[PDB]
Amino acid sequence: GTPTWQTVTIFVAGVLTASLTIWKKMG
């Protein structure tokens, strides 16, 4: 009935993590 918050929180954290990994790998 109520949606879980683990899927939404992990998904947003994955996008944020990609910023740090790509930025660090792109100099």
Add this chain to the structure above:
Amino acid sequence: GTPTWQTVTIFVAGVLTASLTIWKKMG
């Protein structure tokens, strides 16, 4: 560490999508 199989699959989908969005700005 070793997160559940569902967590790793969702992480790749979020990073892969974010990769395309950033690539559009870096193109």
